[PDB]
Every structure is written in C-alpha cells, then in structure tokens.
Ligand binder design. Structure first.
Ligand SMILES: O=c1ccn([C@H]2C[C@H](O)[C@@H](COP(=O)(O)O)O2)c(=O)[nH]1
Ligand SMILES: O=c1ccn([C@H]2C[C@H](O)[C@@H](COP(=O)(O)O)O2)c(=O)[nH]1
Lengths: 264, 264
C-alpha cells in the first residue's frame, strides 16, 4: 500500500540504529501516523502476499476472551506457539483484558460490550476506549501488548478507530496489525448499523530489523495493486457470534510472498 | 506556534459538526499528530499568553500521587475546583494512577519510578509506558483521563515522549497539555542524564467549541514569536523533589491573552 511503502522508505532514510532485546539491531523512528479510508477498500498489503486466515482466527479468539491456544490449534493456526507454555497458556494477554479486565474489587470488565453499548447509546462520546495495558497484570503475560490501546469515534454515521501501537516491526508485524483492526472496525460497524470510516494507525517505536534489508528493498521495488474489498456474508446476532466463514476477501491479487527470518 | 496554528486552521477547514456532552456543538477531527523538537525551544504558545504557574504546580501535584486539591489551594491554583467535591477530592485521577495504580492482589504500582528504572537500566526498551487509563477505577474518578497514555523513547542520548490524548479542546486545553508534558520530559531527562529529544503529541477527538469561533480567528491572525527557553536552576536528588522555584522560562514574549468562555 502507498502509506505502507512510504513508511518503509521513511524508516530506511530516517531511522537510527537501535538495538532490540535479542541483540539484533534495528533502524527505528519514534512516532508515526497513517490513515486508511476504509471506504476506499480493505487495507491488505498487496506488495507481498499476506494470509488472512490466521488474522481472522486470531481476532475471533481475542473476542472470545480466550488466552489458551487450543482454539488456535484446532484450526492449525500456530502464530502464538512461540509464546505459549506447555499447557498452551499465554497468561492474561489481549483477549482476557478485552473481555474480562480484572478489578481490585473482584469484578471482570467487558470492554468490548462496554464499547458496543456506547456506540449505540452515546455515539458522540469521546471516551469509547479499549485498553489491554493492564499495569497490574503485565508480569503474568507471555508478552506486553504491542497494540495496546484503541479508541472509536462516530461522526456522520461513520465509525472510525485509532490504534496506538507501542512497538512495530514494519516488515513482519504491521501488515497483520492493520488488517486485524480494519476487520474489527467492519464487524463493529455492522453490529451498530454504521458505515465504516477511517482506521488511524499510530505508532511508537516503529522499526525494521537489520537482517531484513534485502527483503525491504525487494518489496520497495514493487508496485501497489488495487485494494481488495471485504464482504461479510451474514449479520450475526452479536459481536461474539462471527465465524471464520462469514468473511470473504474479493479482488485480492498480491505480488509473491517474501520470507523474513528472525534471530533467536 | 506554527504546528499549533496549522492544527487550528485544520479543525476549521476540515472539522465536522459534532455535539459534546453539555450540548455545545464542536467542530471535530479524529486523529492528528504533531512533533516538537525540544532542542528548538520550550513549546509554549506565543500567539496568546499562557500562564505557566498553574501548569507547574499541577505537574508537581501529579508527581506527588495526590488527588485532593489542598496542595493546589495552598498555592491558590484553582483549575481543579470545578471537579472537586466538598472535601476537595477528585477520586483516583492522574496522580493516583501514576504513583499508586492499584492491583487486584493488593499492590500499588509506581509507574513513574518504574519508568525511571527503565530509562537508566534498559533505555532501548520499547515498553517504557505510563497509563492513567485504569479501567477498573474509571467510575470513581471525577473525570476520565484526557491525556491517558504516554510512552518514552531513547535514541542517541535523547529522551523523546509520545502522549496519546483521547479528547482535546484545541483552544483551551491544548496549550497547557503540551507545556505540561514538555516540562516532564525535561525533568525526566535531567534525572537520567539524557538530552531532550522530541515531544510527539497524538490526538483522538480534536476539537474547537462553536462558541470559540471569534477567538480562534483572532488568534489565527497573529504571528508566532520565538519560542522561550526553559531553565532548571538546580538538580534535585530525585524526580519527586522538584519545587516550583526550580523552573524559569526565559525569553517568553507572548501576544495578549484571549478569554474563551464555556457553557455550563
Ligand atoms: O503485534 C505485534 C506484536 C509484536 N510486534 C513486534 C514489535 C517488535 O519488533 C516485537 C516486540 O518487542 P518488544 O517490543 O516487545 O519488545 O514484535 C509487532 O509488530 N506487532
Ligand atoms: O487536559 C485536558 C482535559 C480536558 N480537555 C478537554 C477535552 C474536552 O473538550 C473536555 C473533556 O470532555 P470529555 O471529553 O471528556 O468528554 O476537556 C482537554 O483538552 N485537555
């Protein structure tokens, strides 16, 4: 995508050498923002083939408030294997904070339902927020939330959403983080009878790993193709009733996939 | 300031009519980001006189973990009077979340000290974050945090900071939110022996109230003056030991102040 490739070029031209936790260096910039008008089409990177299958199951899993990978395994989705323990537990990550944020007084807060209530009853609210940054449970999580905080907004019958991502691997992580939240905006809007608006991506430490230089130059030489269109085949009774097969992406014609290896 | 006036013009040209909770309409945009190189000077609006006295005491108060306005009153700072109850309590707002985020297991998390520890021991960390968005305590707060979440970043000996502000009154709130966090970046950097870098402001619902149109046009006709320089007179033993008199702003020559009335 145009916005995506411009970011890639910006990290190359303006990034500072910065080390990560494993010791692999990165080229990093701090603070960036991109906007995607969802009416122009589904924001799925075309300059390299992205497989949506995993994204969709992962999102459905988050909505379930599930933090054990069993559901992912029944569908042979292995993207969280790296972090799970022998029982397949990840600790109180995303889904748990979204659906059951624990309070000091013994309650569990359903932020997803809270957000739906606000979108239907008080759409002008400037506090329609979901946060996975639960300070008191950070130590128990396999990993600290990257996509930590997001806010919804309604104006003229259009649902917009801004995500704050504290850390971002532009090559390997970003394509998937964008498609994931754009998808959630489409589900949310369908359930609230609103049109889709903008998905605003805001990043903190936005970077490219130094061992991904050839892959980046290769993708930077490719030309963006038309964006696909997302179609939701049915309208479930609630946000927790979607199923994998309800979604179809039409018109997605990507350039070949590029492999990016990681150090251990 | 240039970035500030450009935002003001953008809300006028691109904002959508949106109602707020009191019923006063606003012109609103969603998602905006500005960057301030703190080495270029202290980001205090010059196209209208801003009084830093209140900003400074409020910040010192936040750092104390104090949520009762008594300290503000001893210094005749009344900016929180509107929200306090008869005892002068605001509930678990900013200072309490910053210094004593309560966990379900009975602990109180000092996010400010946590952040200092990381800046000194693990400066490359991509998780140096402070959040006031404590979902479990929102109902008890006089008001939901506007400046909800911020992240620090170190690269080449420079301390940068990005604030996520969910809601923003460009005329009345913004000048003060910027100066407040820029000040905190200077204190933080002094305590960690780092140079100051960039303060990145990211906003959610960014707006101007409709009864502030004349004031906005008046400020938009003024020319930005040189930015002042902040000087910190001494180096306290810790981040909790600053005092009002440690700060001096030099070279601040603002245009006259503009009053903006609010509906009740
Ligand atoms: O959804 C995700 C999850 C992780 N990352 C990246 C950012 C980093 O390169 C790494 C996490 O490192 P820490 O940031 O946490 O340290 O993975 C993403 O880009 N997106
Ligand atoms: O630090 C602050 C605190 C409040 N506001 C503004 C944003 C809104 O105009 C109002 C809060 O309204 P709600 O957003 O909460 O609804 O005050 C700021 O700009 N800055």
């Amino acid at each position: 995508m145009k916005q995506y490739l411009e970011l890639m070029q910006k990290v190359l031209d303006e990034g500072t050498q910065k080390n990560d936790r494993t010791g692999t260096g990165t080229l990093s910039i701090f603070g960036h923002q991109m906007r995607f008008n969802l009416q122009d089409g589904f924001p799925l990177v075309t300059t390299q083939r992205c497989h949506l299958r995993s994204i969709i199951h992962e999102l459905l899993w988050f909505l379930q408030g599930d933090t054990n990978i069993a559901y992912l395994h029944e569908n042979n989705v292995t993207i969280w294997d790296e972090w799970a323990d022998e029982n397949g537990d990840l600790g109180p990550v995303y889904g748990k904070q979204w659906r059951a944020w624990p309070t000091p007084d013994g309650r569990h807060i359903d932020q997803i339902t809270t957000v739906l209530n606000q979108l239907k009853n008080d759409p002008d609210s400037r506090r329609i927020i979901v946060s996975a940054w639960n300070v008191g449970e950070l130590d128990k999580m396999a990993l600290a939330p990257c996509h930590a905080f997001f806010q919804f907004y309604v104006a003229d019958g259009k649902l917009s959403c801004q995500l704050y991502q504290r850390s971002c691997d532009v090559f390997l992580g970003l394509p998937f983080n964008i498609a994931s939240y754009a998808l959630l905006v489409h589900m949310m809007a369908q359930q609230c009878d609103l049109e889709v608006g903008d998905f605003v991506w805001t990043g903190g430490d936005t970077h490219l790993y130094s061992n991904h230089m050839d892959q980046t130059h290769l993708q930077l030489s490719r030309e963006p193709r038309p964006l696909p269109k997302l179609i939701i085949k049915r309208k479930p009774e609630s946000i927790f009733d979607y199923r994998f097969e309800d979604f179809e992406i039409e018109g997605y014609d990507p350039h070949p996939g590029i492999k990016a290896p990681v150090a251990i």
